[PDB]
């Protein structure tokens, strides 16, 4: 796709769940640099 005209990205901001943070979308690969690679497990709650 393309950014909406005159914009460089989209911000998707949740409006129902007030505790959810934003998601963002870009439309050119050169607009991000993958700086850290994080290797992990999820932990089972106690």
């Amino acid at each position: 796709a393309h950014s909406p005209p005159g914009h460089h990205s989209v911000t998707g901001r949740p409006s129902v769940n007030g505790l959810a943070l934003a998601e963002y979308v870009i439309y050119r690969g050169e607009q991000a640099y993958p700086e850290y690679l994080i290797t992990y497990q999820i932990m089972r709650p106690e």
């Binding site: 943070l21 963002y24 850290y36 290797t39 992990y40």
Partner: protein
């Protein structure tokens, strides 16, 4: 082109990245279906990604955006989870491979909540979970996310019904 530099757990850089991971976990409306059930992670390793060519093209684009936006790149640090992490770190992000329509169209997706990016590491809606056990809530298999530098520029504000 890409080298991966291991950070020690005593390095302040390790600690600040880990802190961003841990502190942006939230509850999800699917009760853990896509990404599993957890409140926190066991961070096994953090590697700095070093690639001169990908960096120069990042900074070249960043300068263009900034000059289009009252000298404001609007640079953030954000999470990205998908099955394509190993290709991304060697070849860079590529919008031509990102043709899957989601909540905000085709494009390259990032999240402020690390737990959001975690839902996609095994695929859309978590796919069939880990390759070994087919478990979307696997506590055994190793997962990977990227913590990325992203240029937003002027960002179109889309309020979503989530």
């Amino acid at each position: 082109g890409t080298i991966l530099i291991d950070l020690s757990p005593d390095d302040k850089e390790f600690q600040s990245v880990e802190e961003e991971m841990q502190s942006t976990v939230r509850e999800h409306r699917d009760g853990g279906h896509a990404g599993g059930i957890f409140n926190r992670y066991n961070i096994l390793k953090i590697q700095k990604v070093c690639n001169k060519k990908l960096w120069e093209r990042y900074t070249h684009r960043r300068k263009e955006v900034s000059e289009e936006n009252h000298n404001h790149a609007n640079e953030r640090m954000l999470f990205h989870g998908s099955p394509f992490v190993n290709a991304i770190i060697h070849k860079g992000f590529d919008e031509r491979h990102a043709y899957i329509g989601g909540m905000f169209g085709a494009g390259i997706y990032f999240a402020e909540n690390s737990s959001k990016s975690n839902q996609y590491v095994y695929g859309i809606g978590g796919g069939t979970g880990c390759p070994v056990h087919k478990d979307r809530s696997c506590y055994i298999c190793h997962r990977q996310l990227l913590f990325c530098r992203v240029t937003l520029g002027k960002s179109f504000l889309q309020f979503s019904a989530m």
